[PDB]
Design a protein around this ligand. Structure first.
Ligand SMILES: *[C@@H]1O[C@H](CO)[C@@H](O)[C@H](O)[C@H]1NC(C)=O
Ligand SMILES: *[C@@H]1O[C@H](CO)[C@@H](O)[C@H](O)[C@H]1NC(C)=O
Lengths: 533, 61, 533, 61
């Protein structure tokens, strides 16, 4: 063992490994610990940095996967399983990985930190989809990816208590941000070019980061793929968080510190086993433990912050996949199945609305049906099916996206929006689901670039272009090539014209107003109705 | 009989349950999350449905 | 589901399962919980009974396996792996199983409770070898087998502390004894005929039981296969136990209750990872956490108790396998390997003695070499190899066995001794290991009786006879058939004549004095020398 | 390269380590108990030897 995969980092030396990309060698440093193992009486507490080690730290592979729940809804089904952890589960899981081209350039390079999604109850950078291998070799970028604590462990909170402050899951990732701001340079990583991007719950964290100053200053640009800090699922009141924790605590078998005390004596398996029960109303796309408004990390609700923060100095990329809400219908919305067209009746569509929009009381539910029913064809199963998926996508992702984008463009931030409309030729889900939640990552990362992987030429040339967009943004802010460019230039989402493009095998096609009408309902009306009921 | 086995933290393994019934423990109300499958047929509660089958293989899907 | 595998037990109803033996149906009730899951803040504490359940308890299968260490010395090697747990590891592991013939007889039947061995750091009744299937169907006996807590969990002690009293591992098994004394009847089980038998560390527990009154009264007869409560490995001083626990505690990352407190916050994986390090001197057949003389369960050392307890009313079966010590040589005694003859030199034999007899200081070590070296052939590798194995077998098992047997026969107890000398035709270990530790269980249980299993006719007819011996003892006390008998009657080990038989394919052959000479050394001399050095 | 993988609580699984070194973490002094094998080659301490190999398969036996 002795090439140039040896690096001194502020805490010791590490030996990486040379991974071969389809286009050549890559320098991967998998496994770098960045915090003291949060086990024993350090669970539920904020991360603490990694004390320096002696000698050379092996870094030839991926570490643990933060203890979590494994979705086993579809045994053996690629679509579902491709998201399951691929390493042993352990609380001793906080480690970040780094990727650099072979050999690491003398010239400082833009850094891309990727935060995994997983509805705040799952996820791991260890996953194949998140393979920085290509984005580094081909584009010549330096990628990074931490493992934040998720679930009970990552977000249980008894606000106003030093034992379980909550939001610690976010704190871990913040730490990884710092480790970069004081180490990435040693990989030829430009400590300025940091561009943190994310999907779903991860994408929500990014947003969560540009809202808390302490975090803010650790990165420069930001990307949000299908998720927002301001949605109805990524935040909970200091009171509700405090409600679930206590409930779980009682469920298990357990005076704040005392409550926590007992919790720390309780088995990870035990805790995981019981997290899906603190959920109040039957619903979908509604997770039990997510960031809480502690009035410390998030001083006030994401909405207020978004509503007033200065953003003129921030470049942002925000987007949505065509069919967002489809994915979650199979988790308990009557009629739906991945094993059939899922042709629903107006009978079931009614229950569908009750579940999907679970916080809305009767009258509001009426407001939803009105808006989504086609009165000239109120019982057409097809329309009803699609409309059902539509209520979930809009309610959770698209509309809140359009909103963040709106409020952000006003406060001077450079915003670019898009809607990825390409269904991969390798999807496993039925045709009726369209381009589901998370099925773009496959491309953003460059997976199609690996000739062993099955895909299509079009898709390959496609993935390449997408890669360019991301990197270009990370390298400058404008996701467009210079004079040498596919002339259909990507227009910055301006509040007034509301333009944005479409990502698919065909060239950039601009459009105006992202769901203008439906969102006006959701973002504008619905709230008021809710306050009134 | 071949069935699937797993906790809330395990992958779906296939374990020969011999001549016995095998289950599927899932959440009763949406989201109807699967909380594990195994051999035997245990009593559930209002919090979780437990479907039990006997034939054929993978019937506790 | 509805036959006669339904039983009401003092805590609820249970539904068993009909298992088919080679000779017909069997009633197996796998899984019966007999104590509140000792997790969270109940770890290191004594067992607590199982609160009654409602409805019918499924009992068609084996439960968890108490968290423990998996020996991975020989990946894929049958000999080694056949002892590894065969169910998920969990602290929620205290469950006993029951076996009865199909259908359960109206006539009360002798009960055989089997305590698994595993050097107090491993084991599970869930293992195939411990299949009560045959012993019940063919002999018409009712077998039972609990899962006691082993390892850190089962025996960590800070004597004179209510948080971790120690010996709790034994306490669990005691509980299972009671559950029998107040439930086994419902299986057609004679509450009098209880005959607890065991191997190695388990066999030591049995002994441990006939020494503590509270336990004693829960059974009538007793069998000890290759292990004793009085050996140098099954007990520790209240001080040494107190030493290791504190050491481990520090190893992990941890004021008695406070010490425990931290321990309870620490991960099973974490604890298992660190148990082999509290071991003081490099040695073999020396385990880190075993029963401790607390002066409560074991009021004084096993020796004193054995030395004075009244035993005239106890029938006992005690025995040894031919080559005991061989097994452990491969765990670090220079020269030895299962992949070769392990022809050792007088050079290494010397180190061999130092390890095997680790508590003995120099002079005593000299005493051992003298005694085991053949001065007319002091360097013959063969003799030296065998002699090396001999020091371990005698020091640990045989001699202490001969001793218990001796002191017991004097105090009026009916004692029968034996030496199982049959090497199975299916052994995987090399020829030089002989009939190693634990390789008789295979037969005692009747495994050869299963025609699917590979063995030899001789071995089959052999296993049948052995089964008879055990059961006969369990059913009356004399391991011999009535008038219809293979006339070579088994003579009760009398102190004076010291007779005992040999178990192998040939008929009972009686012999006098079990290692009379060598043991006189060990049991008699060695102690004194040690006290003097 | 095919090597064995396991903790102190796992069975010996075979995991393709690709083009990398794989280990064997064992206790230094008798009893020389095996405390786990895996890919990569980590630093041990006086408490435990760590043998690392590169070829062939199952070399970290
Ligand atoms: C589709 O499959 C689901 C689950 O098996 C079922 O509830 C539904 O009735 C099926 N048919 C349609 C038209 O969705
Ligand atoms: C047997 O194998 C062991 C382990 O490989 C080795 O130490 C010893 O030298 C070998 N030869 C003999 C004669 O034991």
């Amino acid at each position: 063992e002795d090439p140039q995969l040896l690096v001194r980092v502020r805490g010791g030396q590490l030996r990486g490994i040379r991974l071969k990309a389809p286009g050549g060698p890559v320098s991967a440093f998998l496994g770098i610990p960045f915090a003291e193992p949060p086990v024993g009486s350090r669970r539920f507490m904020p991360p603490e940095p990694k004390r320096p080690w002696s000698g050379v730290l092996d870094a030839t592979t991926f570490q643990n996967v933060c203890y979590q729940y494994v979705d086993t809804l579809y045994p053996g089904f690629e679509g579902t399983e491709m998201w399951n952890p691929n390493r042993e589960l352990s609380e001793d899981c906080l480690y970040l990985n780094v990727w650099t081209p072979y050999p690491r350039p003398a010239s400082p390079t833009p850094v891309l930190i990727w935060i995994y999604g997983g509805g705040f109850y799952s996820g791991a950078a260890s996953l194949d989809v998140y393979d920085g291998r290509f984005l580094a070799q081909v584009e010549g970028a330096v990628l990074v990816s931490m493992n934040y604590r998720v679930g009970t462990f990552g977000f249980l909170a008894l606000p106003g208590s030093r034992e379980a402050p909550g939001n610690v899951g976010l704190l871990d990732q913040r730490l990884a941000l710092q480790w970069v701001q004081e180490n990435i340079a040693a990989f030829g990583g430009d400590p300025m070019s940091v561009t943190l991007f994310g999907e779903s719950a991860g994408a929500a964290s990014v947003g969560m980061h540009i809202l808390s100053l302490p975090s803010r200053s650790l990165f420069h640009r930001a990307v949000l793929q299908s998720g927002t800090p301001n949605g109805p699922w990524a935040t909970v009141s200091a009171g509700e968080a405090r409600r679930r924790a206590t409930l779980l605590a009682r469920l298990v078998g357990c005076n704040d510190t005392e409550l926590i005390a007992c919790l720390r004596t309780r088995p990870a398996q035990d805790l995981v086993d019981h997290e899906w029960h603190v959920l109040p109303q039957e619903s979908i796309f509604r997770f039990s433990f997510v960031p809480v408004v502690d009035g410390d990390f998030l001083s006030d609700t994401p909405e207020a912050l978004i509503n007033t923060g200065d953003f003129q100095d921030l470049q942002v990329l925000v987007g949505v996949v065509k069919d967002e809400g489809s994915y979650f219908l199979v988790y308990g919305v009557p009629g739906f199945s991945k094993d059939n067209e899922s042709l629903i009746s107006r009978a079931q569509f009614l229950a569908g609305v009750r579940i999907g929009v679970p916080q809305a009381s009767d009258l509001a539910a009426e407001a939803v049906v009105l808006h989504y029913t086609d009165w000239l064809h109120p019982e057409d199963p097809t329309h009803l099916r699609d409309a059902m998926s539509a209520v979930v996508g809009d309610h959770n992702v698209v509309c809140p996206v359009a909103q963040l984008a709106g409020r952000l463009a006003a406060q001077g931030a450079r915003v670019y929006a898009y809607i990825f409309e390409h269904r991969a030729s390798t999807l496993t889900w039925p045709l009726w689901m369209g381009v589901p939640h998370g099925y773009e990552i496959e491309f953003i990362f460059g997976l199609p670039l690996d000739p062993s992987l099955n895909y299509t030429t079009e898709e390959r040339i496609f993935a390449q272009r997408l890669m360019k967009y991301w990197t270009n943004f990370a390298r400058t802010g404008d996701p467009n090539d210079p004079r040498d460019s596919k002339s259909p230039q990507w227009p910055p989402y301006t509040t007034a014209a509301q333009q944005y493009v479409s990502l698919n095998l065909k060239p950039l096609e601009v459009r105006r107003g992202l769901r203008a009408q439906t969102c006006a309902f959701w973002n504008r009306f619905l709230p008021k109705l809710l306050s009134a009921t | 009989t071949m069935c699937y086995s797993h906790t809330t933290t395990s992958r779906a393994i296939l374990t020969n349950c011999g001549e016995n019934s095998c289950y599927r423990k899932s959440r009763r109300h949406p989201p109807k999350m699967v909380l594990g499958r195994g051999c035997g047929c245990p009593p559930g509660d209002d919090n979780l449905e437990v479907k039990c089958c006997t034939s054929p293989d993978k019937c506790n899907y």
